[PDB]
Amino acid sequence: ELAYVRDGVIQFEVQQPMIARDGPHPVDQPVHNYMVKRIHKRSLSAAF
Amino acid sequence: PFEIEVLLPGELSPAETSALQKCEGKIITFSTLRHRASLVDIALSSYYINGAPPDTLSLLEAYRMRFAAVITRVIPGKLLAHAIGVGTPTPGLFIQNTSPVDLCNGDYICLLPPVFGSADSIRLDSVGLEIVFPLTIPQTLMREIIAKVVARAVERTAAGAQILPHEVLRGADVICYNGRRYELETNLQHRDGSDAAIRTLVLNLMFSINEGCLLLLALIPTLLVRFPIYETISSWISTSSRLGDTLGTRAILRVCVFDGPSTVHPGDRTAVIQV
């Protein structure tokens, strides 16, 4: 069932590490991400 | 903790519910504090008096009588808010800056109807109502804001009243705060709110001061080297007092930043403590 897919989708989720450091500066916080991607369709043809 | 829940309407267009998501930390005024309320209370419809839309003089008065609340988070089918009233311990109260001027730490928050330019507001055409949000300015900046706006309108009448204008000026009025100049109302054209909303306010102000430095002149004639004369006094004391409490100044919130940037620009949100 590919002729009815009509822009299927996938997604990714990652995290980022961090290091603690002193100093009178704004303190950091751990970060996470979220990304999404779609598909691309194409045909192949032959004659006889 | 006391909180209000505003029922989101049904059959709302996606463009309207999206823009409502943007206004997270804005202030909403209520007439009677209750747990469940409807949109008609927040909308401008319940705000006008004598049929006609409200006026600046009435805008200031209703801000004292009505209670205020702060939106916390929006839901695709629900809307919540917290009161800043009697004693409720609102945790993590953040507001969004709606004024063009910046705010720094230790500045007390106040409220003001939109005077400088055209007020931004969400407009719901499907239901037919719109919600206007109040302006947020610090304490030490409001007293000169009111004086400059009113003085500007008097200058316009004088130029029209006098046969010749006394034009010659110093340039243009500007408001400076944190080294940033605002420069309100460049041109002379575009009398948008010159006499549309501040119209009746300049009237009561153009009068109360007039009988002021006229009564003392007619009561003690030694200053400059059939008639009641008593009900005019009681009338002056009543008005000059009634014009004073509505043109008041009461701090409503205090910004208190911890681990965040000190200054905030128009559009940013910051944590505030309940005074």
Partner: protein, 357 residues
């Protein structure tokens, strides 16, 4: 039960190293607003840029002088109460306590570019009260210092906002509690001048006495502690400052026939001016004389040129029969007389009441 406020700033007016824990710290507005307000509120006839001359030299004798104009967030935000107390020490009545604190703050600091800084700040305030730019709208209030961290010429401090004084944990000193400490020069209780009983609850105020004369202006800073009411403090202060009030009323402004309205309105047969001619067709021959009055009032003492004080509520003390203690202890390498206040709840909005009478 209490809240804290953090802010980073330059250490040219405040040194969280030497200042004792629990002292008062104030902040300043952007100096760029002073000129925008002075050039529009300066009295007629006076020069409006003497403040600019007095202000430019202040930062010329301060580190990073090329960082004025943008306000990126790295300016001298906060300052200490003892700093202003030492800058204006020549005006307080307690001669020895004033000068002791002055030399102490000079020695404990850099002591190299400190005396010049102080005199610049002195005439800076002097020029501040020269064009009616009174320094009670540019000096805010922070709570007592609680914690600090500094690496070089830049410090991050945190102080209490409002609430009980000994409800926090400084957590690095010997004890975890601190009390309010003030120099003995600024302390001035008014009830013991007004001769009333000192029992019960008492409020705390800061006053800014102003003297306005020709080339001689003065500005002190007093921390008053009185049981008087919120607004009645104004009437109480005038009785003690009755001298300066009258001095200002006569030396504040240094840069005509009446009319019998009620008389000629009580009697008839006066020239009338019915609305029929003010309709607006020939409104000059109708008002040809109708009176003359030859009247004008240009030079007169305004309510702003006769001001002599401005106060503001800061906190209260619920414990009746307060027992404030005064003693001398080392401040850096010198001893200064400090007064110690215990159990004082901070609060109150920053609203200034001006005593112009």
């Amino acid at each position: 039960t209490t809240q804290l406020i953090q802010q980073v700033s330059l250490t040219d007016f405040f040194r969280p190293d030497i200042e004792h824990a629990g002292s008062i710290v104030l902040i300043l507005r952007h100096p760029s607003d002073m000129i925008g307000e002075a050039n529009t509120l300066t009295q007629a006839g006076r020069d409006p840029d003497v403040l600019l001359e007095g202000l430019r030299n202040l930062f010329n004798a301060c580190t990073a002088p090329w960082t004025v104009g943008e306000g990126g967030g790295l300016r001298a935000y906060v300052t200490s109460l003892s700093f202003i107390a030492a800058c204006r020490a020549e005006e307080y009545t307690d001669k020895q306590a004033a000068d002791a604190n002055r030399t102490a703050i000079v020695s404990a600091y850099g002591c190299s570019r400190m005396e010049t800084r102080l005199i610049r700040f002195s005439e800076c305030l002097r020029a501040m009260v020269q064009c009616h730019v009174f320094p009670h709208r540019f000096i805010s209030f922070f709570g007592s210092l609680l914690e600090y961290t500094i690496q070089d010429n830049l410090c991050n401090i945190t102080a209490v906002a409002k609430g009980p004084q000994e409800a926090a944990r400084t957590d690095k000193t010997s004890t975890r509690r601190v009390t309010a400490n003030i120099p003995a020069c600024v302390f001035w209780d008014v009830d013991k001048d007004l001769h009333l009983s000192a029992d019960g609850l008492k409020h705390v105020f800061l006053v800014f006495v102003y003297t306005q004369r020709r080339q001689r202006e003065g500005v002190r800073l007093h921390l008053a502690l009185s049981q008087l009411n919120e607004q009645c403090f104004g009437r109480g202060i005038g009785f003690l400052l009755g001298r300066i009030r009258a001095e200002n009323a006569a030396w504040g402004t240094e840069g005509t026939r009446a009319l019998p309205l009620v008389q000629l309105s009580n009697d008839p047969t006066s020239p009338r001016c019915s609305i029929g001619e003010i309709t607006g067709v020939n409104w000059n021959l109708a008002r040809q004389r109708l009176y003359q009055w030859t009247g004008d009032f240009r030079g007169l003492p305004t309510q702003l040129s006769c001001m002599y004080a401005a106060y503001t509520l800061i906190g209260t003390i619920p414990s009746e029969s307060v027992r404030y203690t005064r003693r001398m202890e080392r401040f850096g390498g010198y001893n200064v007389p400090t007064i110690w206040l215990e159990g004082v709840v901070w609060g109150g909005t920053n609203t200034w009441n001006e005593c112009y009478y």
